[PDB]
């Protein structure tokens, strides 16, 4: 605002879970605010999401970035996380933003699974969200679940176990059952305002096809396929992903 | 079990919320178990649900019945309840039931909004649940949210407010935005094992067309129209409701 600029730690509640975020507070009385969503097994402070927030703040656009339930500093077990209770988290954060009287327009920015959270959130709030940016949005998480292969890790898609080991973590059977029947496109397509879609052509975690499908379902989308970029927009592509996002929001 | 029979109060957790229930434990080393789900604004101990759990226990079918979040003895504000978070409540209860070693077949039994919870849960666990009984399932709550008229309380369905004063209660805006888009029949229709559908013909809260519709989506359903019954299967209608429920779960 006019008196404090820079970062602050903010905590919210969603059903007796506490969610821990970082607010990037710009100069100015009135401003636009982006809610930024990290991906699966990630947290609010990846390089991509840090640089996103920072670039946004340099253009006077506020932001908040939170750890989803079961990730980062936020409460709850990873095994109990699903895309749906992430939407619930995202709604608790949308409550916080929409009641700050500094905020003018609200933007949603999500990477990977946080892109699916963003796109379905905007589809529930198409009357409130103004612009949305999706980076490598992971709608393919639904097909992976129908196939029985989530990021290497395999199961029978018709006999899903109670839990699945997944690196050093424990993934919940319910995550996968919800994943198989997520109405991603059905919900996301309710949002008819400006969408920015950024995806790397060398993404091997989430097919570019995912962004090509989002480009079909939105009537107001712009698609950027970044030649050579990976899933994380690593190395030289990160600045590319970050300027696209910033440019679009202004 | 073979040593203890009779009731107990169970406490479960879901996302930092305590869910309070009643477990009825029958005779035998091995038995089937019913999960009984109450409706919108109701609780686990309505006359109807006590009588279901009693009739079941006479057949040595075990049951549990929990207050959903925002109801009865359970945690959370009513205004923060949604059908989605009730499904998550329901999944937490299912975790408890499915991990009991005495339990053979798991049945779902849901009244009104508890019917929607039940049908959706069965659709997500079509490999685990053995049988479903829906009493006046409120699948009409979605169309009601799309029209903008929930039990006579009207609001703009394209501009859903933050909160809706709702007769001595305050229903959450996010309840309504979820309801509009819940994929009730899509998910429910994945359950291809036996379903028993029961609806009174004089229900004025949930149109009988709801049970008619399920009986069309389902690959193995049986429809019981109770001539003259009300939404809550009151007085004489209750024993008919209960017997149909009991006989079916056998
Ligand atoms: C941080 C980047 O990673 C993601 O967000 C991935 C989302 C996602 C992609 C494919 C899947 O099969 C899946 O189910 C676990 C999730
Ligand atoms: C306690 C017994 O009854 C119920 O569960 C009723 C549920 C219900 C019916 C129609 C609706 O438009 C609705 O939106 C909140 C909810
Ligand atoms: Cl699970
Ligand atoms: Cl015994
Ligand atoms: Cl009663
Ligand atoms: Cl009967
Ligand atoms: N200010
Ligand atoms: N985030
Ligand atoms: N399978
Ligand atoms: N969307
Ligand atoms: N588009
Ligand atoms: N036993
Ligand atoms: N309910
Ligand atoms: N109530
Ligand atoms: N009751
Ligand atoms: N009931
Ligand atoms: N409430
Ligand atoms: N609510
Ligand atoms: N009603
Ligand atoms: N509003
Ligand atoms: N709400
Ligand atoms: N939907």
Automatic annotation (TrEMBL), chains A, B:
Keywords: Hydrolase. InterPro entries: AB_hydrolase_Est10, AB_hydrolase_fold, Hydrolase_4. Residues 35-142 form the Serine aminopeptidase S33 domain. It is an enzyme of class 3 (hydrolase). Its EC number is 3.1.1.-. Gene3D superfamilies: alpha/beta hydrolase. GO terms for molecular function: carboxylic ester hydrolase activity. The keyword Repeat does not apply. It comes from the Bacteria. PANTHER family: ESTERASE ESTD. This is Cinnamoyl esterase. The lineage of its organism: Bacteria, Bacillati, Bacillota, Bacilli, Lactobacillales.
């Amino acid at each position: 605002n006019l008196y404090f600029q820079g970062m602050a730690t903010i905590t919210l509640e969603r059903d007796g879970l506490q969610l821990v975020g970082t607010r990037e507070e710009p100069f100015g009385e009135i401003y636009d605010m982006a809610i930024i969503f990290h991906g699966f097994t990630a947290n609010r402070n990846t390089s991509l999401l840090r640089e996103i927030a920072n670039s946004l703040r340099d253009e006077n656009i506020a932001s908040v970035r939170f750890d989803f339930n079961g990730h980062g500093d936020s409460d709850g077990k990873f095994e109990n996380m699903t895309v749906l209770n992430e939407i619930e988290d995202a709604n608790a954060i949308l409550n916080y933003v929409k009641t700050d009287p500094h905020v003018r327009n609200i933007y949603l920015v999500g990477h990977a699974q946080g892109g699916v959270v963003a796109s379905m959130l905007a589809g529930l709030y198409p009357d409130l969200i103004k612009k949305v940016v999706l980076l490598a949005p992971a709608a393919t998480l639904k097909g992976d679940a129908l196939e029985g292969n989530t990021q290497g890790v395999t199961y029978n898609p018709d006999h899903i176990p109670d839990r699945l080991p997944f690196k050093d973590l424990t993934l919940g059977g319910f995550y996968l059952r919800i994943a198989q029947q997520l109405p991603i496109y059905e919900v996301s397509a309710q949002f008819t305002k400006p969408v920015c879609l950024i995806h790397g052509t060398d993404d091997t975690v989430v097919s570019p096809n995912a962004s090509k499908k989002y480009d079909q379902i939105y009537q107001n989308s712009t698609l950027h396929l970044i030649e050579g970029a990976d899933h994380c927009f690593s190395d030289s592509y990160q600045k590319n992903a970050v300027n696209l996002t910033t440019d679009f929001l202004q």
